[PDB]
From a paper:
Removal of the positive charge of Arg120 would also weaken interactions between S4 and the neighboring helices, facilitating VSD movements in the membrane. Again, as predicted, most of the particles were in a closed conformation (799349 particles, ~76 %), virtually identical to that of WT [name] and [name] Y26F (RMSDs between the closed state structures of each mutant with respect to WT [name] are 0.4 and 0.7 Å, respectively). Again, similar to [name] Y26F, the [name] mutation does not lead to any local or other changes in the channel as gleaned from the identical structures of WT [name] and [name] [name] in the closed state. This lateral displacement is not observed in the closed states, which show identical S4 helices in [name] WT, Y26F, and [name]. In both cases, [name] Y26F and [name] [name], the mutation did not lead to different protein conformations at rest but altered the relative stabilities between closed and open states.
CNG channels are tetrameric channels where each subunit consists of a voltage sensing domain (VSD, S1–S4), a pore domain (S5-S6), and a cytosolic cyclic nucleotide binding domain (CNBD) that is linked to the pore domain via a C-linker comprised of four α helices. Meanwhile, membrane depolarization increases cAMP-induced channel activity, suggesting that voltage modulates the agonist status of cAMP in [name], similar to its action on other CNG channels, although the mechanism is not known. Cryo-EM structures of VSD mutants with increased activity yielded cAMP-bound closed states (identical to apo and cAMP-bound WT [name]), as well as four additional states: one gating intermediate and 3 open states with different degrees of opening.
Author numbering:
A (entry chain B), B (entry chain C), C (entry chain D), D (entry chain A): 10 to 64, 76 to 415
């Protein structure tokens, strides 16, 4: 964590130069009662490229050593004229490296479209400070206090970069006019960048909700063209509502394919944990049979009142309840045998042989259950002859 | 619905404080002939966190009880000085909860990109009121009527937040200059948010139309490279036109997979309702045979004049007409036997055996019909031996 | 086409009212030497809801009959005061219907994102005219000419709706201040709409190019991680370049699935037209064999210098050249047997039996050829016993 | 490269006319000491449509010959009045062709969304020059120097097109007011275009990162609903972190399908180069067996500590290590037999027969290995009987 606390320190130094240099270029009466601080900052900025190396002349390393040799403490100490001392701003090249560090250490828990906006706003304010100092530099010599004429310059630059333009402070000289033109263009560019960043950030703020909305609209639009009843359309709408309320509309089978096989098996083993550990025919088997079965359970959701099994039909599947309730009724739907809930299973008689069903099965709410076929079971039983022999015994 | 009519009430109270507090901070002559109303609002705002609980110190519950204890009726009653009475605006924190409620009760029948825009516009106007009151507060003491100087302040704040900047009202004091700078930045930020929200809302307004347009452009671009006739390109274009006119370009097979199996079966059973309930060989069968067949019918669209069956060839399919018309012609296309329309079927002789066809079949318009193979029929007939035996009898 | 020439007429009438009404409300000296025109327009606007019916009280029909009864010719003829004659602008509701017509008759050959922008710009200019008339109405009575004070009003409204705000024309009265505030908000909203529409239009202007660029970047990014030679990366890059130059990067197999089966068969029959009509073993067969084969040819592209067939190996495929050239070399690549070009084929000996190859085959440029397997050929030959018998004879 | 150096020359000529023509229309005292240059430019611009032809009256060729005949050197030489000499700007139509060339020669190594922005900025500055000259033309006759009144005009046009509007330079005449209105509209349009282009460019700057972020958020959102342990969620998160760090989240199987078969085979042969060239049972085989095997190896990633093979189970696969390390332990995980690293393989005994495993295999870090089944091996061995016979010998 020492790296983190030293990066904050070098940031606090490059934002010390980024506020002191342009403001010293305008007021030379400074730089005397801040020399103990700029010596310290120069030391703490020159003894940082070794440490970075312990982690030359490269396309992404030139700023770090260009912003480290003391161009300052020389132009201010020797009192160089105006055109040649303006290279004292080479220390601000360190800001590039600072940004390049902050865009890769903090980019784990922050939206990449918001960190860019925060960096842009910080750069805009830090450039507005320099623009205010520049505007204040090329003004007629006056006797006003330093803070009043800094306030006027900052007011002018803020009213120019936001494209408001009150007009109470205007150029009065060719040089001021050229400066105003160039920084009018700069302000337009910066405001355009801000608007574009905000538009990008807002445009991608509700993705799952809009995807679910449009895939419901598409289904309803196609479904009305085929002239299907209002009742069944209402059932479909309420199913989509339940899907959005529970799992935000994500499809289980397309979600559980971005995982590699061992993680997918671990997830499946923690989901279908206890359910298959109590099935009367799978007992006596090893862990490889169970692990083979668990990967072939297929999910399906049944709404309220829907039929799962009809009494009399052949049937070949077996169902495991996960997150719902189920009722068992006779062939006439008049006598209720029992009620099954999470963790239990029904239909285990179909795997043994293809005898017709013996009772009717009705969903009481949204069931969210898993099912296993018979051909899949036969294929994955043809490899474990001892188990298949035992099943033949029970048959 | 009582919850809905009480949420509107608490909204009408938090927009009563949001208009009365900043305007009372400027004009102290108020708060005497509005005390019966603010007592009532304070009661109706303190007796709302129990009811919310009947539905503490949580990250999303702190505003509700911070905006409920009467910081008002104390600063105004005891006449606290300017810097310390400004915490009377804690009641405006209730606006967060109000927004958080309106974004989850009304988010069922409203585009999520439009509710955010409406909330943003409401917040912008409600903040412009407060900014106008703030600007009017730090002005020199004058004798003008209260409404004229409220009109001037509102005019200034509206001409600043829209980034127009006429310039007839400008700062004339350091404090006014600092206030103007900060709210120039606020106005730029708000206008950027508005533009970004509008851009996001507009960018996603024609999705199906643009998707259809680009998937037609891609087909034509690829299709010209292979040097294919203008006639067949015109046929493809008119097919895509018909598809867009009828079902907005949605593909039937990719649409009918977002449904679970029972809903998909219900949809198919209501689509292919009567058609298979009159087929001469499927009669005598149960409901499971029909329900098995219905899930294996495959859609296909035939344009005008196209050939569906050629006289003499082997053939193995059977076709059910859904939304079109069909004509039956002899081997020489000279004598018209009959005309079939919606609900009827042809080609049933191919399922029994592989004898060559007996007549030619021509589409009269866009047919939009369903078809069943023979290998699929054989696979799904190998499980119902009684039916297969009867088919063997008819063969 | 008479409908098209009459819709233009009703557009020219609703843009006659949309320019005459607000300008007459300000200058009452008009409406005398334009009565023969507004009578004609009223007739041509009342005798248009029957014709629309030949193509009441509906949610999308109320404007058509609200904008048809003569509220005009009554307020101007009886000289109604200012607050009550302002309902003369009900005729501008016809603009909604006009827009609703122009958005569905011209929406076939125009980008839907550009028609909306053109409509928005037209509405903005037509509203700016009315705003200028409104501003000119509530001004002090002056003696200036009508065109000079219309020019000043139009200048003010254009400098307000574009958010420029020069400030040389400003309010000077409470009513003018309220008007200015409301239309400052209107101008901000309109400029936001314009910017959002332009952003949407520009954001979707190069789709295929960006898709190809990103799918090349993804391939190269993954391909460098596996540490694969610069030569083969250059070959992949030049293959993608050739694909983009010829068919804009579109994949043949994913393109040729948006067509229904008869159109897909027609496309395939026009592509592989002559090639299979000269193959020595397929001769003597009917049209159904050819039509069955044509649907199972699979495309593949070979770059320059690549090997297609190695002398000595078993091999099972047959290749048809479509858009390239091929050379045939001996086992030592020293003696060049022959050169094949578009329309010819090689490898036909593999279908008869699985004898080893007899010569080497090299691509001379990007070949763009089609291939047929052997198992597919065997499956689709097992249904036509006469042909399979003849092949057995040649074997 | 001569074409490249001549296109730069014609660009430097069309940006010579684009700066000289409007500035000469205002100051007639020019055009005498620049005739040797405009004669040269006219020659170098008329002798460029033959060379373009060596690479008429076409929809995309009309500018090239409209901007080549000397409308200049005639209006300036004969001193034509103001309304008729304004067609001297036909030479600026050459800018269209120049842009149309620069958008297709430099569009290989530049983002298409950035070249458009650079072209737009260049056009905006070049139009601002002309707008400044136009504004300076219709001003009262003054005695000021030419550069001061060019500076004022450029200042006015820049403060108008950026929508700032200081207001210190304003119209003072009907013609100036009309000019100001039209170019206020132009400036609003240009600023809207700039903002839209910037928004489009920024909106698509982090695609892979956002895709990875959202596909991790979807997995975690679905994964919490099933109530799965924090440990396994942490394992999934760290797996996704490793995937992003190594290959930017790209899936190997969906990446390696955009290549044609020969390039895919070349890539696979360079990846699995040495590994299969040392396998004890595959030795003695030819190149076609290896080339057949290499296309059926399937990738899989194992995290640290995960189990790859359990001692005692049947097993049927064989694994090749690519970019990781593996340890071999006994049945009790107490004695470490050996350590395998990149280039080696384990599990080769399962292909010979289905005997149970003999040792446990544990990942030490993220392994990134390839695996081969047994049924696939059996299918692709049933075609090479000599190899299958040798395997039967070793079995
Ligand atoms: C978001 C929240 C942001 C808050 C920023 C607050 C900045 C506070 C700056 C100071 C605010 C302040 O009240 O001080 C003023 C003096 O400023 C001065 O002369 C000092 C001159 C320098 C002021 C600094 C300029 C940059 C301010 C940019 C602010 C926005 C940044 C975002 C007036 O006081 P005072 O009556 O004594 O006047 C002296 C006499 O001549 C007139 O009475
Ligand atoms: C969308 C539609 C929106 C409509 C808003 C209408 C707001 C109506 C506000 C009042 C409109 C109005 O006509 O009243 C004015 C008075 O305002 C006054 O002094 C009252 C002062 C307070 C005005 C309220 C300020 C906020 C207005 C923000 C409006 C936009 C909001 C969106 C002039 O009358 P009056 O000749 O008697 O002048 C008195 C004498 O001194 C000059 O003749
Ligand atoms: C894109 C291309 C667009 C071109 C628009 C051209 C509009 C032409 C309008 C007229 C242009 C014009 O030159 O006419 C002016 C007169 O305007 C007048 O008073 C007539 C007053 C009404 C002018 C119309 C106002 C709307 C103009 C909105 C234009 C942009 C629309 C986009 C000056 O002439 P004139 O020396 O005789 O002055 C009289 C004396 O008092 C001063 O010399
Ligand atoms: C990004 C970087 C961009 C840099 C642009 C620099 C442009 C340099 C232009 C000239 C800059 C300059 O300092 O020259 C000025 C003169 O301008 C003049 O009269 C010359 C008049 C023509 C100036 C050119 C106008 C377009 C400038 C558009 C610039 C932004 C373009 C982006 C003042 O000097 P000087 O004290 O002698 O005044 C004479 C006396 O009357 C007052 O002292
Ligand atoms: N009395 C009962 N209590 C609970 N479940 C039952 C009862 N009778 C039948 N079932 C279940 O209902 C199923 C319907 O027929 P199956 O042959 O699929 O197997 C049956 C059992 O799983
Ligand atoms: N006279 C007829 N009227 C209606 N349909 C017919 C007639 N003759 C043949 N068909 C249908 O046309 C089909 C063409 O040959 P099939 O063997 O497919 O079965 C035939 C019947 O379905
Ligand atoms: N002399 C030749 N001229 C043209 N093509 C040939 C010649 N010899 C062989 N081929 C083709 O090259 C193929 C290579 O071996 P096949 O058995 O696939 O069948 C061969 C023919 O199609
Ligand atoms: N002593 C050993 N050193 C290295 N690898 C081994 C050793 N013993 C077994 N293995 C490998 O571990 C595998 C586990 O059982 P298999 O039958 O798959 O084949 C085995 C060999 O590939």
């Amino acid at each position: 964590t020492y790296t983190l606390v030293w990066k904050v320190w070098i940031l606090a130094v490059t934002l010390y130069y980024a506020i002191r240099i342009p403001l010293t270029l305008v007021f030379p009466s400074l730089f005397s009662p801040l020399l103990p601080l700029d010596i310290l900052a120069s030391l703490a900025l020159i003894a940082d490229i070794p440490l970075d190396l312990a982690f030359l002349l490269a396309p992404s390393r030139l700023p770090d050593l260009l912003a480290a040799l003391p161009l300052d403490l020389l132009v201010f100490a020797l009192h160089l004229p105006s055109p040649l001392s303006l290279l004292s701003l080479v220390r601000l090249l360190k800001l590039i490296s600072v940004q390049a560090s902050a865009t890769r250490i903090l980019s784990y828990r922050i939206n990449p479209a918001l960190l860019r906006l925060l960096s842009l706003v910080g750069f805009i304010l830090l450039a507005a400070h320099g623009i205010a100092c520049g505007w204040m530099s090329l003004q007629p010599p006056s006797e006003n206090p330093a803070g009043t004429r800094y306030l006027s310059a900052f007011y002018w630059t803020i009213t120019t970069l936001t494209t408001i333009g009150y007009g109470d402070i205007t150029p009065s000289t060719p040089t001021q006019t050229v400066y105003t033109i160039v920084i009018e263009l700069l302000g337009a560019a910066m405001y355009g960048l801000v608007i574009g960043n905000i538009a990008s950030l807002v445009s991608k703020l509700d993705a799952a909700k809009l995807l679910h909305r449009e895939r419901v609209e598409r289904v309803t639009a196609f479904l009305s063209y085929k002239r299907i009843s209002p009742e069944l359309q209402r059932r479909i709408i309420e199913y989509f509502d339940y899907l959005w309320e529970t799992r935000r509309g994500y499809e289980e089978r397309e979600v559980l394919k971005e995982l590699p096989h061992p993680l997918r098996l671990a997830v499946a083993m923690e989901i279908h944990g206890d359910v298959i550990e109590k099935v009367p025919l799978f007992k006596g088997a090893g862990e490889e049979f169970i692990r083979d079965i668990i990967l072939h359970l297929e999910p399906v959701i049944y709404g309220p009142g829907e039929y799962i099994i009809r009494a009399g039909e052949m049937g070949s599947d077996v169902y495991f309840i996960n997150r719902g309730s189920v009722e068992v009724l006779s062939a006439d739907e008049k006598t209720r045998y029992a009620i099954l809930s999470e963790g239990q299973f029904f239909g285990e008689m179909a795997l043994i042989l293809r005898a017709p069903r013996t009772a009717t099965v009705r969903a009481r709410a949204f069931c969210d259950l898993y099912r296993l076929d018979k051909e899949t079971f036969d294929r994955i039983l043809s490899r474990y002859p001892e188990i298949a022999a035992q099943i033949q015994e029970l048959a």
